[PDB]
Amino acid sequence: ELTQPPSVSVSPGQTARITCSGAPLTSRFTYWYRQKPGQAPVLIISRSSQRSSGWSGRFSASWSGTTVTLTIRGVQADDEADYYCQSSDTSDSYKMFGGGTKLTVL
Amino acid sequence: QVQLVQSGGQMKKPGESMRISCRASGYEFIDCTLNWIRLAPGKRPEWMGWLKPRGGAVNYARPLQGRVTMTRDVYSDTAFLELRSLTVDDTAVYFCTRGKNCDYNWDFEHWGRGTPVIV
Amino acid sequence: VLTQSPGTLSLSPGETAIISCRTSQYGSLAWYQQRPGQAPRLVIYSGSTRAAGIPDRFSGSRWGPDYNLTISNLESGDFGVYYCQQYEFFGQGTKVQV
Amino acid sequence: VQLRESGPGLVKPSETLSLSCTVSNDSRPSDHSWTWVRQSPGKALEWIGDIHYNGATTYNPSLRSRVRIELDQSIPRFSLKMTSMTAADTGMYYCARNAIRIYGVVALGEWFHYGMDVWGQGTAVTV
Amino acid sequence: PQEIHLENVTEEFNMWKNNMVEQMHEDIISLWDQSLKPCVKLTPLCVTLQCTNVTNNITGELKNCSFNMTTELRDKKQKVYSLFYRLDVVQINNKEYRLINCNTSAITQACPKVSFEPIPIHYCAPAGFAILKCKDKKFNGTGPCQNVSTVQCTHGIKPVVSTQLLLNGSLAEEEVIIRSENITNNAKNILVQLNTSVQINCTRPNNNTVKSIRIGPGQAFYYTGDIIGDIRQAHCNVSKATWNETLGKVVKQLRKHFGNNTIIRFAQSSGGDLEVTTHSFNCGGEFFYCNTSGLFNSTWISNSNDSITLPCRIKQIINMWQRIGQAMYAPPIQGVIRCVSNITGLILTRDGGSTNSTTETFRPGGGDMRDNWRSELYKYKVVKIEPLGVAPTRCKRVSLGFLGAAGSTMGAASMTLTVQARNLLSGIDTHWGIKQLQARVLAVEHYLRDQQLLGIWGCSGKLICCTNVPWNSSWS
Amino acid sequence: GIKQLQARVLAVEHYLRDQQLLGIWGCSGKLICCTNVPWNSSWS
Amino acid sequence: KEYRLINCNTSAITQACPKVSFEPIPIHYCAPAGFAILKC
Amino acid sequence: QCTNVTNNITDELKNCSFNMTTELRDKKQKVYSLFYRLDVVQI
Ligand SMILES: *[C@@H]1O[C@H](CO)[C@@H](O[C@@H]2O[C@H](CO)[C@@H](O[C@@H]3O[C@H](CO[C@H]4O[C@H](CO[C@H]5O[C@H](CO)[C@@H](O)[C@H](O)[C@@H]5O[C@H]5O[C@H](CO)[C@@H](O)[C@H](O)[C@@H]5O)[C@@H](O)[C@H](O[C@H]5O[C@H](CO)[C@@H](O)[C@H](O)[C@@H]5O)[C@@H]4O)[C@@H](O)[C@H](O[C@H]4O[C@H](CO)[C@@H](O)[C@H](O)[C@@H]4O[C@H]4O[C@H](CO)[C@@H](O)[C@H](O)[C@@H]4O[C@H]4O[C@H](CO)[C@@H](O)[C@H](O)[C@@H]4O)[C@@H]3O)[C@H](O)[C@H]2NC(C)=O)[C@H](O)[C@H]1NC(C)=O
Ligand SMILES: *[C@@H]1O[C@H](CO)[C@@H](O[C@@H]2O[C@H](CO)[C@@H](O[C@@H]3O[C@H](CO[C@H]4O[C@H](CO)[C@@H](O)[C@H](O[C@H]5O[C@H](CO)[C@@H](O)[C@H](O)[C@@H]5O[C@H]5O[C@H](CO)[C@@H](O)[C@H](O)[C@@H]5O)[C@@H]4O)[C@@H](O)[C@H](O)[C@@H]3O)[C@H](O)[C@H]2NC(C)=O)[C@H](O)[C@H]1NC(C)=O
Ligand SMILES: *[C@@H]1O[C@H](CO)[C@@H](O[C@@H]2O[C@H](CO)[C@@H](O[C@@H]3O[C@H](CO)[C@@H](O)[C@H](O[C@H]4O[C@H](CO)[C@@H](O)[C@H](O)[C@@H]4O)[C@@H]3O)[C@H](O)[C@H]2NC(C)=O)[C@H](O)[C@H]1NC(C)=O
Ligand SMILES: *[C@@H]1O[C@H](CO)[C@@H](O[C@@H]2O[C@H](CO)[C@@H](O[C@@H]3O[C@H](CO)[C@@H](O)[C@H](O)[C@@H]3O)[C@H](O)[C@H]2NC(C)=O)[C@H](O)[C@H]1NC(C)=O
Ligand SMILES: *[C@@H]1O[C@H](CO)[C@@H](O[C@@H]2O[C@H](CO)[C@@H](O)[C@H](O)[C@H]2NC(C)=O)[C@H](O)[C@H]1NC(C)=O
Ligand SMILES: *[C@@H]1O[C@H](CO[C@@H]2O[C@@H](C)[C@@H](O)[C@@H](O)[C@@H]2O)[C@@H](O)[C@H](O)[C@H]1NC(C)=O
Ligand SMILES: *[C@@H]1O[C@H](CO)[C@@H](O)[C@H](O)[C@H]1NC(C)=O
Ligand SMILES: *[C@@H]1O[C@H](CO)[C@@H](O)[C@H](O)[C@H]1NC(C)=O
Ligand SMILES: *[C@@H]1O[C@H](CO)[C@@H](O)[C@H](O)[C@H]1NC(C)=O
Ligand SMILES: *[C@@H]1O[C@H](CO)[C@@H](O)[C@H](O)[C@H]1NC(C)=O
Ligand SMILES: *[C@@H]1O[C@H](CO)[C@@H](O)[C@H](O)[C@H]1NC(C)=O
Ligand SMILES: *[C@@H]1O[C@H](CO)[C@@H](O)[C@H](O)[C@H]1NC(C)=O
Ligand SMILES: *[C@@H]1O[C@H](CO)[C@@H](O)[C@H](O)[C@H]1NC(C)=O
Ligand SMILES: *[C@@H]1O[C@H](CO)[C@@H](O)[C@H](O)[C@H]1NC(C)=O
Ligand SMILES: *[C@@H]1O[C@H](CO)[C@@H](O)[C@H](O)[C@H]1NC(C)=O
Ligand SMILES: *[C@@H]1O[C@H](CO)[C@@H](O)[C@H](O)[C@H]1NC(C)=O
Ligand SMILES: *[C@@H]1O[C@H](CO)[C@@H](O)[C@H](O)[C@H]1NC(C)=O
Ligand SMILES: *[C@@H]1O[C@H](CO)[C@@H](O)[C@H](O)[C@H]1NC(C)=O
Ligand SMILES: *[C@@H]1O[C@H](CO)[C@@H](O)[C@H](O)[C@H]1NC(C)=O
Ligand SMILES: *[C@@H]1O[C@H](CO)[C@@H](O)[C@H](O)[C@H]1NC(C)=O
Ligand SMILES: *[C@@H]1O[C@H](CO)[C@@H](O)[C@H](O)[C@H]1NC(C)=O
Ligand SMILES: *[C@@H]1O[C@H](CO)[C@@H](O)[C@H](O)[C@H]1NC(C)=O
């Protein structure tokens, strides 16, 4: 699986960095989801274009070795949520899904 | 004055692959088809396949397809025969041959010294 | 598709050896002489044409699908295994022995 | 392009679960990978499996032996069957359109998963 | 062009011994070398390359390669980035790579203005010679041809380079024609001429940005700078229905050649270099190497706009008509490449080697390129005209129908001498100019040898010259 | 070199075309060849 | 300061052989066989 | 950089070591080759 910290805590207005890592994460795109209690885990980091992931957004993601960082700019109380990463297997035989990191804003 | 020089004296266990060379001389290597033929006492000589330089095209004998590979280096005038998986039935002397006249490659006037392979 | 009948043919030196070969295909045939411990050499090609350097004792062919290599006056350089080739197929072979 | 789920309110222990998901007013459901996820309340979310209209399926290797996924190509509905689920295995089951965007020729592998953009809801039905 | 049918001429043709194929091969090599010679030699490109994979920003046919390249000044070097294909780049020593043909052979850059579009070439005999065209609709390619005509020269033959499949050119008139020197000889190639073409839509979808740098005084090196869009891979398309029908036609003709209960299997090229194992062809100047496994993936048992997409790799360093010491670099072309070709034939190789019959497997075999031109020149034979004849008689002393009466009896063929005697002087790029000069000198030489023979015989202008030589019954 | 030899061949070909044309006219050996073709008064 | 030869970035500069002189000499252009040169 | 070939122990062939180019312009190789005295001159 993709190892994640169990929790992260930042102050409002700061940039949050939520990370995950694993072997299959080095060759397959890492997608990120934001789940609110009582609501579906909608996408925050989607893939668009084969050679960039880009996508104008408040959020943004960085790939470095075996670790992928979700960088959230301008974190506010509205961003408190469970953030999960997903990536496919190196042969795309299954999708591997991370345990999630809880982001709280205090 | 064509003389084919094979690298041999190779002994291997069942399940291993063999790779044997054949260095060409006395003619333009790139322009004439070479053949690999397997001879053994008590068995019909089995043609392994032809390799045609100036492209390197191959034709592997039907019962060997998936196990026999042939390649070459036109800059060393050398052909190579490789068998991916040997069994006890592959014990034989492997010969590198060329036809008498490159228009018809089956009249094997030019044979190499031969490579005994014991499995 | 290519069957050689004599098998282990036996003859003393000086006798004539007749090596039959039944062919199921049309195409040029070749005869090869393999001495023990040595690579085979071409002796006959195109049915009855002698390879360069081969003594005149080697000959014989027919228009039908039955070839008959005639080897007369056998010497110490003979008495090997003779093979019958038609394209990829070489036949069982026929050991020539005293 | 909306997703709405359906299923029983209660199932028996160690019994097959059957869920469905209805796709509403989309234009090309045949492009996307239709998938299900399972989440234990308060705990980690995991993917269980997916299916494409071309007949390809994938399943989580730890769960594969007990999960079967089907889609109806005539009526745009996505079905899930899970054999012998119990309390230690169950959780809220969500359906999603793991959207696929095509950049080249799909026969050559020139498609990339976009992600589960559109989501339905789910209930941790058990016992 | 005036073609003259030869009413009753039966002429033995042999496309496998046709000197036009050897001459066309030599001419294509000479034209390639002459067009490539006055171009950038790319000696400075044989450097150690620092190549990384072309990446998606989140994670491999193309490699982004960094080299210390020369400039117009020899004391200064520049760092150059360039996207090369994996098939052009050989790994030496992690990150250190070099070009495929830098350790062996020299790589000459094609001049950027040179066009690789095949343009039909008519191979024409000098006056005094003629080309016999075989019009037999189902012609085997060898043996007697019953419908024979003469031309000064052939139809336009595009010098198309292709390997497994024959692109563009002539189609068969009635049915797929399977031509081989000996179909039972597995060392010979089988040239399939189709009666219907299979359209092959092929593209390099990459929007390559082409950069140009100097690598010496006057030596401009053209290379791919970046890709504006998605990388994708090049590919060719043929429809399933047309290709499957084409293979059905091919197996019907092979069953005509083989047993009528034979299982015919098409399988991928079992080995060889990329020019043999893939369908190698020039698409607008770019060099495509199409996998073609998906075409030759079928077992035929004797009894919709859905396309087969063939992956194609692209090479920039090409060694075509494989020769010791030669290589060419094809510069990239700005933008997206698409070409639509007609597949007019196939080159198949039968495997054989089995005593268990009823099944035959035919794999593509690129072979040499003499077969691609043989598949166009199969109808043509070059003959020297011998206009001076001698025959017993009772004497004591427009270009229509040029070789007509050749298959007719004498006498009837003695009434056409006026037209045969005419057009023997005129007929019915350094390399081409020298071939034109050789053709004109040879035509004049033969014309004058025949006119000189007439002169010394006292026949300088009679056309029918009766003489004082008694006929010797020992001659005929 | 090539262009000069091509010029020589062209000179030979033009000579032979004139000699061949005279031969067709039966004039190849006469230099001044009187023949049986009436002159049209329209030709000045 | 740094300089380069004016034509090194555009052309391959070839040095004239020291034995070769550029003094002009009369060149006579002659008609080939079958041609004449007319002079006014 | 040439030395006499010698008899290994004591003094027409010169054993010459030089920095020759390789198939890659960036890289050089040390080459040891035997030249005849008539093929070389001193600098
Ligand atoms: C050999 O045979 C082969 C097999 O037959 C054949 O393969 C075919 O190749 C061609 C290319 O050569 C392929 O064409 C591609 O097709 C893709 C899919 O096209 C469909 O979908 C798009 C998207 O439209 C969505 O939205 C509208 C809006 O309402 C809906 O109506 C659509 O249904 C669809 O919505 C879906 O998704 C929603 C999301 O929730 C769902 O709700 C919904 O239900 C749907 O599922 C349409 O635009 C297409 O129609 C248009 O097609 C072309 C123009 O594209 C026109 O002719 C036509 O009239 C229509 O306008 C179609 O319906 C395309 O995505 C893909 O386009 C990319 O590539 C082309 C290259 O030509 C680029 O020019 C173009 O810009 C696109 O690049 C962008 O997108 C890709 C993919 O994400 C990125 O990788 C790329 O970087 C770039 O991204 C940029 O734009 C993005 C926004 O789009 C943005 O996010 C990025 O940040 C960035 O800015 C292309 O057209 C074709 O699919 C192949 N076929 C098969 C079966 O595989 C081959 O050609 C043959 N070869 C030969 C030589 O003959
Ligand atoms: C010589 O000819 C023979 C006879 O034709 C060929 O062998 C035949 O091949 C076909 C082609 O597969 C077999 O048919 C069926 O194949 C499927 C598997 O399909 C493959 O190809 C499709 C291409 O569209 C692809 O989608 C599949 O991969 C998806 O599913 C995998 C499941 O394991 C998964 O690992 C993979 O990642 C992918 O899923 C991902 O993408 C989808 C996109 O839709 C997405 O939704 C999903 O979530 C994932 O991200 C797969 O490669 C089988 O399931 C069928 O059972 C069936 O086999 C023929 O059966 C087969 N015949 C024989 C006799 O073997 C030879 O290949 C041919 N040779 C050559 C060299 O070409
Ligand atoms: C078999 O025959 C077909 C049909 O002739 C042939 O496909 C054709 O190839 C030519 C050359 O690639 C294509 O014409 C090109 O079209 C593009 C369209 O963008 C032009 O940009 C190209 O121009 C380039 O070349 C010019 C040379 O004169 C330059 O002046 C110019 O600057 C460009 O560099 C060029 O016009 C033609 O469109 C296709 N035909 C089709 C239907 O697509 C095919 O290649 C032949 N097969 C083989 C193997 O060669
Ligand atoms: C394949 O190659 C052969 C040459 O090796 C081609 O010619 C064939 O040659 C054989 C003799 O080697 C001919 O044999 C015939 O045999 C019968 C019965 O004995 C006899 O009556 C005939 O007069 C003749 O000798 C065979 O006919 C001849 N083939 C043909 C078609 O005439 C052979 O043609 C090549 N195969 C193909 C398909 O082109
Ligand atoms: C080759 O070099 C010359 C000289 O650098 C270039 O021509 C221009 O020369 C004037 C001299 O005053 C400069 O001010 C210009 O800036 C030069 N132009 C450029 C574009 O550099 C000439 O253009 C160069 N040739 C090429 C092909 O780049
Ligand atoms: C072919 O010739 C027919 C007559 O053939 C002639 O006479 C026979 C006896 C042979 O000597 C043969 O060589 C001669 O050509 C014609 O009737 C027939 O039409 C001709 N066929 C064509 C022109 O297609
Ligand atoms: C070096 O050249 C030889 C031919 O001389 C070739 O076989 C070899 O593959 C090349 N080296 C590499 C590393 O590819
Ligand atoms: C490039 O891709 C290949 C794929 O096999 C991989 O092994 C290699 O490490 C990659 N190299 C880099 C520099 O990313
Ligand atoms: C260019 O040369 C320098 C010399 O120090 C070297 O460090 C550098 O790596 C070289 N660059 C490339 C791209 O090979
Ligand atoms: C020759 O042409 C005629 C028609 O002119 C045709 O009937 C005949 O079959 C042709 N011959 C062959 C051998 O194809
Ligand atoms: C092809 O060869 C066969 C061999 O028997 C012959 O009968 C047939 O007439 C030939 N076909 C043509 C068109 O010449
Ligand atoms: C092409 O050849 C096939 C051979 O089976 C034949 O059936 C078909 O009618 C021919 N079609 C055309 C258009 O020539
Ligand atoms: C391709 O074939 C069709 C008939 O199938 C023909 O009309 C067309 O001219 C051909 N085109 C090319 C480019 O060869
Ligand atoms: C190929 O392209 C032509 C136009 O160039 C198009 O009309 C045709 O539908 C395409 N066909 C195939 C088989 O790819
Ligand atoms: C290659 O590397 C250079 C480094 O500056 C970069 O600018 C360029 O975009 C890279 N090319 C690709 C295709 O990634
Ligand atoms: C091709 O034609 C054969 C006819 O025997 C048919 O059975 C087969 O399904 C066809 N194949 C394809 C891929 O359409
Ligand atoms: C073509 O593809 C097949 C499988 O698709 C592969 O096994 C084969 O090696 C490829 N051939 C070449 C020449 O790349
Ligand atoms: C490539 O991209 C550039 C971006 O400016 C665009 O102008 C050009 O038209 C594109 N070319 C093709 C062939 O798609
Ligand atoms: C006819 O030919 C024979 C043999 O060539 C020769 O001896 C004889 O003299 C010739 N007759 C005449 C009359 O010249
Ligand atoms: C002379 O010219 C006239 C022009 O009308 C033509 O009718 C006539 O036949 C010509 N006569 C000769 C002898 O050429
Ligand atoms: C080689 O030996 C000769 C013997 O006369 C001596 O003079 C010379 O200096 C020696 N050279 C070297 C390089 O040792
Ligand atoms: C080769 O170059 C190195 C550079 O350090 C130098 O020390 C060495 O002496 C040179 N070798 C020869 C044989 O000239």
mmCIF file of C-alpha atoms in Angstrom, chain B residues 30 50-60 70-72 74, chain E residues 270-273 275-277 322 367:
data_model
loop_
_atom_site.group_PDB
_atom_site.id
_atom_site.type_symbol
_atom_site.label_atom_id
_atom_site.label_comp_id
_atom_site.label_asym_id
_atom_site.label_seq_id
_atom_site.Cartn_x
_atom_site.Cartn_y
_atom_site.Cartn_z
ATOM 1 C CA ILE B 30 26.442 -9.544 -46.000
ATOM 2 C CA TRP B 50 18.621 -19.889 -42.350
ATOM 3 C CA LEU B 51 19.884 -16.404 -41.584
ATOM 4 C CA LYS B 52 20.091 -13.947 -44.478
ATOM 5 C CA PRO B 53 22.335 -10.892 -43.858
ATOM 6 C CA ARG B 54 21.609 -7.503 -45.481
ATOM 7 C CA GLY B 55 18.539 -7.449 -43.267
ATOM 8 C CA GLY B 56 19.279 -10.378 -41.013
ATOM 9 C CA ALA B 57 16.104 -12.209 -41.971
ATOM 10 C CA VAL B 58 15.561 -15.576 -40.317
ATOM 11 C CA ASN B 59 13.655 -18.749 -41.071
ATOM 12 C CA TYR B 60 13.461 -21.135 -38.141
ATOM 13 C CA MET B 70 19.631 -16.474 -34.952
ATOM 14 C CA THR B 71 21.459 -13.174 -35.258
ATOM 15 C CA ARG B 72 24.607 -11.768 -36.828
ATOM 16 C CA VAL B 74 27.924 -7.871 -40.366
ATOM 17 C CA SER E 270 10.372 -14.431 -36.268
ATOM 18 C CA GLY E 271 13.549 -12.329 -36.227
ATOM 19 C CA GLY E 272 16.078 -10.080 -37.895
ATOM 20 C CA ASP E 273 16.881 -6.405 -37.802
ATOM 21 C CA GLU E 275 14.092 -3.313 -41.376
ATOM 22 C CA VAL E 276 13.047 -6.986 -41.561
ATOM 23 C CA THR E 277 11.047 -7.486 -38.375
ATOM 24 C CA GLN E 322 22.342 -2.250 -45.078
ATOM 25 C CA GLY E 367 14.432 -9.354 -47.314
#
